[PDB]
Every structure is written in structure tokens, then in C-alpha cells.
Design a protein around this ligand. Sequence first.
Ligand SMILES: *[C@@H]1O[C@H](CO)[C@@H](O[C@@H]2O[C@H](CO)[C@@H](O[C@@H]3O[C@H](CO[C@H]4O[C@H](CO)[C@@H](O)[C@H](O)[C@@H]4O)[C@@H](O)[C@H](O)[C@@H]3O)[C@H](O)[C@H]2NC(C)=O)[C@H](O)[C@H]1NC(C)=O
Ligand SMILES: *[C@@H]1O[C@H](CO)[C@@H](O[C@@H]2O[C@H](CO)[C@@H](O[C@@H]3O[C@H](CO)[C@@H](O)[C@H](O)[C@@H]3O)[C@H](O)[C@H]2NC(C)=O)[C@H](O)[C@H]1NC(C)=O
Ligand SMILES: *[C@@H]1O[C@H](CO)[C@@H](O[C@@H]2O[C@H](CO)[C@@H](O[C@@H]3O[C@H](CO)[C@@H](O)[C@H](O)[C@@H]3O)[C@H](O)[C@H]2NC(C)=O)[C@H](O)[C@H]1NC(C)=O
Ligand SMILES: *[C@@H]1O[C@H](CO)[C@@H](O[C@@H]2O[C@H](CO)[C@@H](O[C@@H]3O[C@H](CO)[C@@H](O)[C@H](O)[C@@H]3O)[C@H](O)[C@H]2NC(C)=O)[C@H](O)[C@H]1NC(C)=O
Ligand SMILES: CCCC[C@](C)(CO)Nc1nc(N)nc2cc(F)cnc12
Ligand SMILES: CCCC[C@](C)(CO)Nc1nc(N)nc2cc(F)cnc12
Ligand SMILES: *[C@@H]1O[C@H](CO)[C@@H](O)[C@H](O)[C@H]1NC(C)=O
Ligand SMILES: *[C@@H]1O[C@H](CO)[C@@H](O)[C@H](O)[C@H]1NC(C)=O
Ligand SMILES: *[C@@H]1O[C@H](CO)[C@@H](O)[C@H](O)[C@H]1NC(C)=O
Ligand SMILES: *[C@@H]1O[C@H](CO)[C@@H](O)[C@H](O)[C@H]1NC(C)=O
Ligand SMILES: *[C@@H]1O[C@H](CO)[C@@H](O)[C@H](O)[C@H]1NC(C)=O
Ligand SMILES: *[C@@H]1O[C@H](CO)[C@@H](O)[C@H](O)[C@H]1NC(C)=O
Lengths: 743, 751
Amino acid sequence: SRSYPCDEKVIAECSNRRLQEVPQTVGKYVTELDLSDNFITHITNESFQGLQNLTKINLNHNPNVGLNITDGAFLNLKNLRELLLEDNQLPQIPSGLPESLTELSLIQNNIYNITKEGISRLINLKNLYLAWNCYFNKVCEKTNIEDGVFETLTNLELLSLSFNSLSHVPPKLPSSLRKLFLSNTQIKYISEEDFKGLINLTLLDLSGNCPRCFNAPFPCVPCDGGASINIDRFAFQNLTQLRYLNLSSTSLRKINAAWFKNMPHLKVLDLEFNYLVGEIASGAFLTMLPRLEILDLSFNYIKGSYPQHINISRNFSKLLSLRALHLRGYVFQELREDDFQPLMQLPNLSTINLGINFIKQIDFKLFQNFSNLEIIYLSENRISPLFEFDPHSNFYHFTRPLIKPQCAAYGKALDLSLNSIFFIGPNQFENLPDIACLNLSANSNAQVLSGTEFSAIPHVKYLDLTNNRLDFDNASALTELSDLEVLDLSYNSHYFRIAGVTHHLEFIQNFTNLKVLNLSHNNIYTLTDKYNLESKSLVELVFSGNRLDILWNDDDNRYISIFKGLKNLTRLDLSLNRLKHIPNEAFLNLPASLTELHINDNMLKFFNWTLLQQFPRLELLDLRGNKLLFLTDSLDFTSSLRTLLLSHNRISHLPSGFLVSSLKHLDLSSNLLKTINKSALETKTTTKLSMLELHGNPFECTCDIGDFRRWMDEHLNVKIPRLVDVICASPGDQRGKSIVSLE
Amino acid sequence: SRSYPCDEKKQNDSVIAECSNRRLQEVPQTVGKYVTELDLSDNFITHITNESFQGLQNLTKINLNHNPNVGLNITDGAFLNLKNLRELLLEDNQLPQIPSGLPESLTELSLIQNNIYNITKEGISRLINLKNLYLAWNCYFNKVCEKTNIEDGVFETLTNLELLSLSFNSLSHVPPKLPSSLRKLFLSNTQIKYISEEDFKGLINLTLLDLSGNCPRCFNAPFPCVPCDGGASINIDRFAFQNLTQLRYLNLSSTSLRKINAAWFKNMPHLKVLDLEFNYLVGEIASGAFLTMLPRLEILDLSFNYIKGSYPQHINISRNFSKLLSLRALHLRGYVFQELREDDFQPLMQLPNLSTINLGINFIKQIDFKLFQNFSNLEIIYLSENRISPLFEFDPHSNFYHFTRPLIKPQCAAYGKALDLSLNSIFFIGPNQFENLPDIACLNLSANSNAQVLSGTEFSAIPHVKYLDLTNNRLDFDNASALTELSDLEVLDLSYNSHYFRIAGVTHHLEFIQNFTNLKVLNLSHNNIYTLTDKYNLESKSLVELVFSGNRLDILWNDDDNRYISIFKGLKNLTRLDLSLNRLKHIPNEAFLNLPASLTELHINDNMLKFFNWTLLQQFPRLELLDLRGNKLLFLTDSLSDFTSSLRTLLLSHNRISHLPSGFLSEVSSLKHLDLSSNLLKTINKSALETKTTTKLSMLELHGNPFECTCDIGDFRRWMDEHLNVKIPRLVDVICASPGDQRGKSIVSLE
Ligand SMILES: *[C@@H]1O[C@H](CO)[C@@H](O[C@@H]2O[C@H](CO)[C@@H](O[C@@H]3O[C@H](CO[C@H]4O[C@H](CO)[C@@H](O)[C@H](O)[C@@H]4O)[C@@H](O)[C@H](O)[C@@H]3O)[C@H](O)[C@H]2NC(C)=O)[C@H](O)[C@H]1NC(C)=O
Ligand SMILES: *[C@@H]1O[C@H](CO)[C@@H](O[C@@H]2O[C@H](CO)[C@@H](O[C@@H]3O[C@H](CO)[C@@H](O)[C@H](O)[C@@H]3O)[C@H](O)[C@H]2NC(C)=O)[C@H](O)[C@H]1NC(C)=O
Ligand SMILES: *[C@@H]1O[C@H](CO)[C@@H](O[C@@H]2O[C@H](CO)[C@@H](O[C@@H]3O[C@H](CO)[C@@H](O)[C@H](O)[C@@H]3O)[C@H](O)[C@H]2NC(C)=O)[C@H](O)[C@H]1NC(C)=O
Ligand SMILES: *[C@@H]1O[C@H](CO)[C@@H](O[C@@H]2O[C@H](CO)[C@@H](O[C@@H]3O[C@H](CO)[C@@H](O)[C@H](O)[C@@H]3O)[C@H](O)[C@H]2NC(C)=O)[C@H](O)[C@H]1NC(C)=O
Ligand SMILES: CCCC[C@](C)(CO)Nc1nc(N)nc2cc(F)cnc12
Ligand SMILES: CCCC[C@](C)(CO)Nc1nc(N)nc2cc(F)cnc12
Ligand SMILES: *[C@@H]1O[C@H](CO)[C@@H](O)[C@H](O)[C@H]1NC(C)=O
Ligand SMILES: *[C@@H]1O[C@H](CO)[C@@H](O)[C@H](O)[C@H]1NC(C)=O
Ligand SMILES: *[C@@H]1O[C@H](CO)[C@@H](O)[C@H](O)[C@H]1NC(C)=O
Ligand SMILES: *[C@@H]1O[C@H](CO)[C@@H](O)[C@H](O)[C@H]1NC(C)=O
Ligand SMILES: *[C@@H]1O[C@H](CO)[C@@H](O)[C@H](O)[C@H]1NC(C)=O
Ligand SMILES: *[C@@H]1O[C@H](CO)[C@@H](O)[C@H](O)[C@H]1NC(C)=O
């Protein structure tokens, strides 16, 4: 049958549905139940009375804008393995939890007391998350950890107590632990006893203890006098399995090399937001990490200091397994070749990260002297022409890839974005490696590209030129990049805005391998001499955020064939072009090779459906966010349409038998359908419709809805998502309830 | 006595009825019988007949433009029942012909943007009182049209015609037999290749002649452009303007002129404005004998005369330019040249009244700024949109070849000499960028991608700037002495400088605001401010208006952080504060109580507020305007009168208020303007309509509410009847939503 209120694929997706109590209509065979972001206020032993096969329960953020849990409310669920109770304003750990629990997360509550009565019986616990309960300027209490409360959990592998006021590492920790998170715990001193027996530990996070608070984007409290964290010389002597060490924001001025004497597997060392400029120049500890792969030393700048060069110790040459060196926020003016000599013979160093250093000039000749550089990240510098925090993410840096993977996959990547290379000189890219991926976005480049600017790096396959002010006055622009496959020219509207200047786009045709071209948000409304775009290779063209409403206006025919010359085109995005109307000849001149057409977010008051006959490969047609009022009677016009997106229009009536042929996905949500008559379901053929979206329609829940209700019951192969949002607008006794909950 | 469907206003004892854009299908017969001016524009009216305007005889002007909205059938003599109509507006109506039977009373008739290709004598020659006749934009561009047939001598009868505009129709020749009463003649884009002597021989009182767009310059045209055979110039004879002694405006833009006959201007010594845009006059600008024949010329526009494919080192200005002693503004856009030296503008430096020089869109790379000091009195130096580096889609009522907007915003130019360097690439300001400059009072450095750390010495050479535009840059605020050398600075615009503000790891210092004694207006909008360094408060004993829209007060006033709780309190003189577009889901009670008590205007619109602590208004005794539009407010307070004695305007549109609290229109007798439009009000019952008191409530907006139009409405309906002093705008949109018998229907339309 059709599940309600949840969607059961056995997991029951039942989140964000404005539920006020645990639904009693959940299938008795569900394995995992996700009830997050609902308005649930109480949990008793009757709430999950019929779901004894439950292993995972998600009750995060309830009620959405506290959660009362009775003692033993979960006790009857003897298969409950994972219980997520985040953002519930819980004042205590819930009493009488099932001993079958292996993962429990109480992140972001008001729990200031970790008691034996609450935790010391869940001896099967492997992951325990208690982070973010008392932090910053929250009015809260210092965390009380009963002596030996974790001593019972002999199978505990992960313990997270970060962002609580602990002041001391808890004693009597089980030696089964592999990951210990103690970030922002006000722990000023690490004794020799604190981790004496954790011989299985692979991760240790002591970040944010005695923090560096200058320019902190959060309420920050330094240790007395901004002193360093006090780590005993033998505090790590038995952590021989450690792979991850996070010492970010611990006010370190000196790194004791003896910390790593017995740490042969250390792979990632985080040292952000310290005062390690002197250690970077000396680096006695660097001798001890020949297996280290990632070293983050970012934001160690000295306040008010803008040195001429970066001082990299020669001992960086001992990091023989280094693959990624992160040196953001060191702040220096010039990168000379000899400054990076200690790094030039590392065999696996493929990522160098020098973002946000206010570097004025770089001798790009030095990057060729490297063994295996794959990612050169120089974004956000000063190079000139030649609750607030996600508790489940990294706190001191974003974890997204430095360069988009679609660009980095082509080969070596150079990122010069967010600088002020406002024009490319003739020798800007001399003595560089064979760059395949180049990011020059947001440089305010206003120059006329002619066909020589990228001659020194002619093998670029993916070129990012977004957010500039490029001046297209040469038909030979970018033609020296004959192997170019992806070109991004989004947000270059500066000169396209001005009618009096020339706009030449003819260079598009001089490419044999160009596949992806993005001209979005350029305000294109006039072109010079050649009015048509032409390419025999181009596969995808993104033309959103332009003025096709002007290019195709009724008193102008020069642009009637603007896209016809894109003979290989399969994907075309015409969204956000302010189109109230598409001339029939202009639509008929779109490439017949199209398989995907987006005309969403315009102002289309009418769509000529019969013209679809000239597009036998059209699988996807996107017309969401328009003002369409009518559908065609005999959709005779296509045998290829698999997806029809029509949400946010003004359709008030559905044609007879519309629910067609190869249509598998039909989106009619957010329209003006009051009902779906029996005429629309009087289909001859057997339907292949697998998803039909109808939420947001002002359905009239009288007796006339019964014919469509039975159609739903007959076709359970047609998945109707968000049935809780397919809501009756009429009559008053049904306004607010789902159409599936009537007589 | 409340009007419907039109809004009947009053203007110097005249009666206007504003009835535009109301989805009307027929001309309403409920207008007042005293109305003199009726605006029925932008409706869905399809027919105009004998009976469409019965009994409305003081009617002097009618606006039927844009009908129907997204043709208009006018029957013969549908107006002649009138006796006083002087102005008839019939624009954009798809009329196939000039309507027949229009009254002899017409002094102005506008037929712009129709399908009229036949100017017959039946239609126009009977209207002896016509002063202005508009027929432009009927066959133009690639529109499927017909050539304009002008019946010979049809304008011969209108001996009172002062304005005739036939622009953007295919005329081929200047119409013969024009009445000598003509003072303005528009023949733009009319495919008139030749101007003979008989063409304007009899119009001795003409003050403007528009011949633009004939034999046009078609390169880079933003419209379908058809040049004369071989790109030839327009052919105007030597004596074509000999009898035009009263001409003050001459438009010859886009006529592909290569040479100008100086004798054309011999007998027009009063010519004030000469438009020569979009031609090929680079040679005439350097030689130019005609420049000696314009002694009273005040405005000379030579823009976009560039030679295609040419990028000369310097601009070549004839020394005969010094003969333009009455010149006030020189527009030299689109000349395209690399360098501006002081020797190149010597012919201009002795003109007494030259105040505006416009050099935009020239791709100038270097300018010797010392040349502007030698000018007698330059007030506007427009150098926007160049390449300086560190040292229907056309409005038928606007100019077709340039925008008529002021070059500098008037609020800036009012302070004195203005220098516009916007839209260049001055990405940092060197120690001598502004040396040898005049006493600049108004400086526009916007959109230069400037990433400099201002530190107090960048503007020393021009220390009397009162209005500084630094918008759309990437400024780096790491110095507390930034801009402090501009001691007289009164307006500082720092909009759209979010580049470094969004990076949490770099510093953001805003302490320099306090060092100004005369700063009145500060705009920090759309900067994404959410973290500051060291000092968390904005302080100024002079600041009057702070625009803080488009920032992140939702993060700054986060519940787990109190550092920014008094961010605005140190603005002791602040009277206007804009906190819109800050994604606020709630304001902490202590945060609102720390807003400056001197506030009279507070904007918190377009956020996400679901609750508002109305009690806190007790601490703002001068608050006159509270703008809470575009939020998610669910309730109103029982006790607004107990919380404020000063609030005059309360804007609450686009919220979720479904109930009006009892006694909401009495008691509060400082409130003149209450906006409850686009809310969730289903009814307003008698209890909220109590009036104890004085009630200064004058305006009450309610359109967009889903009104329950049963008999419960009846009491609010009769509250409207008994309170005509309360204007309720747009009754057409105060619409019943239920039941279906009255849906889509205005609430005054009911028994
Ligand atoms: C100090 O440095 C530490 C070492 O880098 C940081 O630790 C990391 O912390 C983040 C933030 O929570 C963790 O990220 C999460 O990991 C979980 C679990 O991931 C695993 O399992 C899933 C499927 O079960 C799998 O897909 C993943 O790839 C993992 O194998 C994710 O569910 C979250 O979405 C999020 O990614 C890291 O896992 C953790 N690193 C390690 C090695 O455990 C620590 O955050 C730093 N301290 C601060 C204050 O930032
Ligand atoms: C300019 O237009 C291009 C072409 O569409 C944009 O690039 C593309 O961005 C989409 C995301 O909208 C990428 O699709 C995705 O790939 C990921 C990773 O495999 C996948 O998980 C997603 O489901 C989705 O399929 C697409 O790969 C990417 N194409 C290329 C060649 O990079 C680009 O983002 C636009 N630029 C701007 C500034 O908007
Ligand atoms: C400093 O230079 C900048 C760059 O030219 C000036 O900005 C421009 O300002 C004008 C006037 O506000 C904008 O024009 C208008 O657009 C609005 C909305 O589209 C419209 O309602 C008005 O009728 C007018 O047409 C123009 O778009 C804008 N351009 C850019 C690129 O920002 C700025 O005004 C100058 N500052 C001073 C004090 O003069
Ligand atoms: C940055 O914020 C300032 C301060 O509000 C903005 O300036 C002001 O813009 C308003 C219009 O939004 C001007 O108001 C108007 O003045 C005209 C002319 O008198 C009047 O006809 C209107 O009814 C309205 O009252 C105001 O004068 C002006 N103030 C100043 C000192 O220039 C500015 O536009 C904002 N900048 C950006 C880029 O948003
Ligand atoms: C105002 C339009 C100039 C038209 C013309 C002559 C075309 O060649 N010139 C230039 N057009 C463009 N688009 N950019 C340039 C940049 C320069 F630095 C110099 N000249 C040009
Ligand atoms: C990573 C932020 C460094 C913070 C610190 C040391 C503040 O003094 N430095 C600079 N901060 C800012 N905001 N801008 C600059 C620009 C420069 F050219 C040089 N240094 C700075
Ligand atoms: C490190 O680089 C060398 C090249 O000298 C290569 O042989 C080796 O496989 C690399 N190591 C890893 C782990 O990729
Ligand atoms: C280029 O840099 C910009 C700015 O950092 C970034 O938004 C964009 O994703 C980058 N592009 C690629 C392909 O990495
Ligand atoms: C393109 O630029 C090159 C180099 O500046 C130039 O030689 C060529 O003429 C240009 N092509 C044009 C303007 O069509
Ligand atoms: C058409 O697109 C396909 C898919 O990328 C590509 O393989 C083919 O080469 C393109 N056609 C031409 C002529 O380049
Ligand atoms: C749809 O396009 C066809 C052209 O094939 C045309 O004949 C038809 O009139 C169009 N329909 C509408 C409603 O304009
Ligand atoms: C409004 O703020 C005051 C603080 O003066 C507080 O006492 C009151 O409870 C607040 N009201 C609401 C509804 O939060």
C-alpha cells in the first residue's frame, strides 16, 4: 500500500513533515526511522509500540522551532542500535536507554552531567557524541563527568566531548577507543597519565584549548596571558597508532619533537591558528614525520607583520611522504624560487595551498622545479599583472575540494582566482607546468583576448574565466587553446551590458573539442556582425541570465537562429531570460539534436506543444516557474519525452488520458489543479508513469476526488512524493489535511 | 461617497480619476460626473462606443494607452458626444487606422505604437485646434508593416499645430505642405535620404528639427539597421535650413555624416543643442569649420563617432572649439583613444561656461589629471567606463541615442566639483593618484575592483570630498585611520564590498567611522558583514542614517554570542536605520533595546521574523516609522497604545497576520498610516473598529487579504462607509476569497 505520512523505500523517510506526534501509521517492517525536523514534543513507551524491528531512530531537531522523553521510553526496542537525539534541548541523558545501543548522539543539547546512571550500562556503545552542549556565550554549566563513567564502555571506539567545559581530560577512559574528540574543552594541561593506555587511538583532537583568539569569529577565551597549551613531554608516548593529530588553535609557539618519538603512523597533523612562524623556519619536529601526508600550518601569521618572504625550514625536505601542504594565512609579499627549495624534491607533494597570503608577486618559474605538483592553489591574494557552526564539519577550515573535480580531473591545476590580474600580459604564464586546469575567476580582467594570451600554456582543457569584465572584440579569442573542452564565462556582463561597445562571440566555432560552454548571467542582448552561435562539437550551452526576451523580440529577426549552428548540442539552458513568449520560428531553430531543454524561471504565458515534433531526441523538458495555463490535448508531438517538469505554473485542468507514452516523470506540483477528473484517468494505453508530483495544488476534497483517489490505489507503481504536502484547500473541514485522508 | 473602481484624486481644483491597471474589461460607468481627467490605461478594454463616455462632459483628457493589456475597437464618432476633450491618449492599441469622428476640441492626440500606415485627410484634417500630434513608432525595424501614406496636404489645415512627430515610420520624403505654426518637428528613423529646400522653407517658427536615424550608421546597431546605399551620408541641401532662424535644437545623430557644411548654421545663431552622435565626424572634430558658426551653442554631443578598428593615441580636438563661447556641456563618448594629454584640450580651457565634459566609454588608459585645473570652471568630469589603471524594448518617449539620466547623482554633484572615475581598473590608489586635481567635493570610485587597505593618506590631495562613492569594490578594512583625512566627509557609500568581509580569517576594522565630525549618511549595504576585529561596535556622534541591509545580523546577533549586542548603540545621533535583508529569524530583546533611542525611522523588512516584541517600542519615544514588511509575523499586540505615543506609519504587508486585535484603530492616535496588505486577514469585526478616540488614521491598506465575504464583512463595510477620511487604496484588489459565489471580487461589490 501507499505509505503515510512517511515514505518507505526498509527505511522510513519521515522527516520535515510538521508531525506533532510519532506517527502510528508506520510500517511494522521498517528498519530505520527518520523523524527529524518535526514538531514532536513527547516520547513514551507507547510511541514505538508496533515497530519492534527498529535499529535506527532519528529524532534530531524536535520540536522544530524541548523534547520530553520518559524513562525507559525506548527500552522495549531490543534491536535499537542507533539513536540520534540532537538539537532537542535535552536537560539530561535520557534514563533507561536500551543496552543494544551502539551509536548514541546527544550533540547540541543542554546536558551538563554525564552520569553512570545514564551511560554506564550501554556497554555495547561504539560511538558516543556529546559535543556542543555548553560553549561560547551560551548560558550553561560546566560539564560534570562522573568518575569512571566511560570505564564500563569496553567497546567504545569513538568519544566526542568537544565544545564542553571540561578543564581536564576525563580519567578512566576505555582503551578500546580509536577516536577521541576534545576540542574547545578548556583543557589547559595534558598530563602523562591522560592518554597512557589508549594504545588503539588513531585520532586525537585537542584543538581550541588555550586558543588563539585574535580575529576569532566566535566568543573566544584565551588561557591566562594567551599562554600555550601545556602538553607533557610523555603525554603521547603510548599513542603509537595515532594517524590524526589536531592541535589547531592551541597557541603553540614550540613543537616538542619528542611528542612524535613513538608515532610512526602519523598521517595528518593540524596546526592551524597557532604562533608557529618561528617553528616553520626551524622545524626540529619535522624530522619525526617522514610518513606524514597532510600538514596544515595555516593562519599562523604574526599580527601587524607583512614579511617580504616566507621562511621555510630546510627540514621540510624530510617530510618524504607529504602530499598536501597548507600554508594559508602566513601573510607575505613575495614568493621567490629559493624559498620553496626544501619542498622541491618531495616525491609525492602534489598539493600546495597558498591562499589568503596577500602575496604581491610570484616567480612562477619555481613550480616547474617540483616533482609531482598537481594542485597549485594561489586563490585570494594580491597578484597583479606581470546555531552558526555545523557540529558535524571541520571547525577551522572548509573541507570542500580546493579545485572543482571536473577541472582537476584533466590534469595539473593552477588557481589564480580572486586576485587582480586585470589583464594578461604577454609573459604572464611563462615557465609554468603543462597546465590542464586554469582558474582566473574574479580577477576583474577587462582585456580583449586575441589568441596569444594562453600561448605558454596551450593545453588547458578546462578554463574558468567567471566573474571578470572580459571585452569580446576579437574573433580569435582563446583559439590558441585548441584542446579546450570546458569554458566558463559566467558573470562577465560588464561590457555585454553596454550597447555601444562591440560583442564578438565568433571564436566559439574555432574549437574542435569544446564540449561545455557557460555564458550565464552575462546580460547578453546584442551581438556584433555575427548574430549566431556556431560549433560542431559543443554538447552543452548554458545561456541563463541573459536577455533572449530582447534578442527574440517581435520586431527583430537577426537572432532567430542564434542556437541553430550548435549542431551537436544536447543540453540547452534558457532559464532566467525573462521570456514571456518564444516565437515559433525561433523555437523551431533550436538544434534538433537536443535531449535536454530548460526554459524554467521565465514568464511564459503560452507554450506551443506541437513544435515538439522537430525534436525526436528530447527526453527532458523543464518549464517550471512560468505562467503556463494550458496543456495540449494530444501530447502526436513526441515519442521521446521521459521527464516533464511543470511545477510553479498556472494549470487549472488536466487533459483526458494525460497520465503520454515514454513519460516516466511528470511534475505538476505548485499549480492550480482543484481536482483530477475521471476523464484525465480514462487512458487507453498502459502507463509507464513512475513518479507524479502534485503537492501544492489547491485540491477540492469533496466526493469528486474519490475517482483520483482510487486511481492512486490502482497504480501503486506511480510514486507520489510528499503526500503530506498534497493538501486539501477545500472544504473548510478538510483544509490542511492530505488528500489521502478522506472518506 | 467613496469611489470605485477608480481612485478619484484632486489637483489644483481639478478632478482626476486614476483608473489604470485594474483588469477592467469595459469602461466603468461608476466614475464621477465631475471628473475632468480619466486614466484608463493598462486595462483589458476591447470596445469604445457611443455609450462608453455618457454624461462625463467636463472630461478634458482621456488615457486609453495599452488597451487591451496582453486590439481596441473604437467606433466612428465614439467621442464626439464630448465637448471639452483637449488631450486623447491612444497609444499601443493595435489600431489599424486613425479613429474617425474625433472631436474638434482636441489639442493633443497621441497614436504612438499602433498599426496606422495611412494618415488620411478624413481622420486628421478636421481637428483645427491640434497643438501636438504624436504618430511615431507605427512601422519600424523588422515589424511587418506598410509604408506610411501621408495624404497630400493633410497637415495643411492644422494652423495651430506646434508639435508633429512622425518618427519611426517609413516616410521616404519630408511631407509637403506643413503648417507654419510648427515649432518642433520629429522625423527620426523615417528613411528620408534627401533634404531639399522646399522641405522646411515655410516653417519660420521652428525651434527643434529631428532628422536622426536617416541614412544611419549601422555598425554595432542594437536594432535592425538599414543603411542608405553604400553607407552614404544623408543628403541635406545647402539652403535647407536658411529660413530656420529660430532653431534651438538640431538632431542629426546617426546620419552617417562625414562632412558638415558650415553654411548650414549661417541663419541659426540661436542654436542651443546640436546632436551629432553615431556619425563619422573624427575628421570634422579635428578640422571643423562649422565650429565657428555656433556662438550660442550650449550642448554639443559628438558621441560614438569612433573609426571602426582604430585606437588612436590621442584625441584630435580642433582649436576652432574655442569659438564655442556659450558651451556648457561637451559629450565625447565613444571616440576611442589611448591617452589624454593636457595639450589636447587647450581649445576648451578658455570657454567661460563649460561645466560638463563627458568622456565615458573611450577605453582611455592614461590621463594627465593636471589639465582639468586649467579649465575656467569645470563642475562635472565624467570619466566613467574607461581603462584607467593605477598611476517593445525602446521607450517611445525617451531619447533613442543616449540615456537622459544625470551623469552624476544630484545628491553628490550638489556638494561641488564632481569627478567620476567609476568602472575602471584603479585597483589601488598610489600616493600621487589624485595630485594636480581641482577641489573635488564629489568623487565616484565605484566598480574599480579596489582591494586597498585605506589608511588615511590616499585622498590627501583632495581633502574636501563630502560625498565618496566606493561601491562595488573589494576594499580591505585593516586600518583604523581609513578615510580619516576627509575631515568634511558627509556621505560615504561602501555598498557591495563583501569580498573581504565574507572571509572570516582576515581582519575587518570599522573604527574609522567615529573619527568623522560631519558624517551624516553611511551605507554598508550588501557587504555580508558577520565578524569584526577587536571593536564590535559602530560609533559616531554625528551619523544620521545608517544603511545596513544585506548583511548578516542573524550571525552577529546569534544567541550564543553577545559581543555584538550593542553594535549600533554608539550611534548617538542616528535617526534612520535600515536592517532589511539580514535573514533575521528573531532579534534578542537586549539587542533591540540597544538600538539608538534617537531613532525615528526603523526598517526591518524582508527578513524572517516570526515574532516581534512590541513592548520594546516603549524605549523609542521618537519612533515614527516602523517597517516590518516581508516577514513571517503571526500576531499583533493587544496593547500598541501602551507601547508607543509617536508611531505614525506601521508597515506590516507580506506577513501572516490572520486576526486584528480588539481596539486597534482607536487609542493609537499618532498612527496615520497602517499597511496590512497581503496578509492573512479573513475578516475585521466590529471589536477592532472601536473608536473611543481621536483617530488620525488616514490610510489603511488591505489588498491581498483572503477576505471571507459572507455577512460578517458587513460591519467592516459600514465602517468604511462611516469613515471616508480613511483612504483605502486599490479597492479593485481588496478582493473576496470565499465563498466561490464572490471569489475574485472586491469587497465593496456586495449587497
Ligand atoms: C581536528 O582534526 C580532525 C582530523 O582531521 C577532524 O576530524 C574529523 O572531523 C570531521 C568533523 O566531524 C569528521 O567528519 C565527519 O565524519 C563523519 C563520519 O565519516 C565516516 O563514515 C562515513 C559513512 O559512515 C563515510 O562516508 C566517511 O567518509 C567517514 O569514513 C561524516 O558522517 C560527516 O559527514 C563528517 O564528514 C571526520 O571524519 C574527522 N576525521 C576523522 C579521520 O575521523 C576534526 O574535525 C578537527 N577538529 C575541529 C574542531 O575541526
Ligand atoms: C557553468 O555551466 C557549467 C555547465 O553546466 C557548470 O558546470 C557543471 O555544474 C554541474 C552542477 O550544477 C555539474 O553537475 C554535477 O556533477 C556532480 C559531480 O559529479 C554531480 O554529483 C551532480 O549530480 C551534477 O551532475 C557538472 O559536472 C558541471 N560541469 C562541468 C563541466 O564542470 C558550471 O558550474 C557553471 N558555472 C557557474 C559559475 O555557474
Ligand atoms: C558612481 O558610478 C556608478 C557606476 O556608473 C553609478 O551607478 C549607476 O547608478 C545609476 C543611478 O543610480 C544606475 O541607474 C539606474 O538604475 C535604476 C535601477 O535599474 C533605475 O531605476 C534608474 O532609473 C537608473 O536608470 C546604474 O544602474 C548604476 N550602474 C552601475 C553599474 O552600478 C553611481 O550612481 C555613481 N555614483 C554617484 C554618486 O554618482
Ligand atoms: C546607499 O545608501 C544611501 C542612503 O540611503 C542611498 O542614498 C539615497 O538614495 C535614496 C533613494 O534610494 C535617495 O532618496 C530619494 O531622493 C530623491 C531625490 O531627492 C527623491 O526624489 C526620492 O523621493 C527619495 O527621497 C536619497 O536622497 C539618497 N541619499 C544620498 C545621501 O545620496 C544610496 O542610494 C545607497 N547606495 C546604493 C548603491 O544602494
Ligand atoms: C565604443 C566601441 C568601440 C568599437 C571599436 C572601434 C571596435 O574595434 N573598438 C573597441 N571595441 C571594444 N569592444 N573594445 C575596445 C578596447 C580597446 F582598448 C580599444 N578599442 C576597443
Ligand atoms: C590572514 C589575515 C592577516 C591579518 C593581518 C596580519 C592584520 O594586520 N594582515 C592583513 N590584514 C588585512 N585585512 N589585509 C592585509 C593586506 C596586506 F597587504 C597585508 N596584510 C594584511
Ligand atoms: C610517491 O612518488 C613516487 C615517485 O617518485 C611514486 O613511485 C610513489 O608511488 C608515490 N607514492 C604514493 C603513495 O603514491
Ligand atoms: C575558480 O575560483 C572560484 C573562486 O574561488 C571558485 O568559485 C570556482 O569554483 C573555481 N573554479 C574551479 C573550476 O575550480
Ligand atoms: C584579433 O587580434 C589580433 C591580435 O591583436 C589581430 O591581429 C587581429 O586583427 C584581431 N582580429 C579582429 C580584430 O578581427
Ligand atoms: C558530438 O558530441 C559527442 C559527445 O561528446 C562527441 O563525442 C562528438 O565528437 C561530437 N561531434 C563532433 C562533430 O565533434
Ligand atoms: C504553433 O506553431 C505552429 C507552427 O508549426 C503554428 O502553425 C501554430 O499556429 C502555433 N500555435 C499557436 C497557438 O500560435
Ligand atoms: C520583550 O522584552 C522584554 C524585555 O524588556 C521581556 O521582559 C519580554 O518577556 C519580551 N516579550 C516577549 C514576548 O518575548
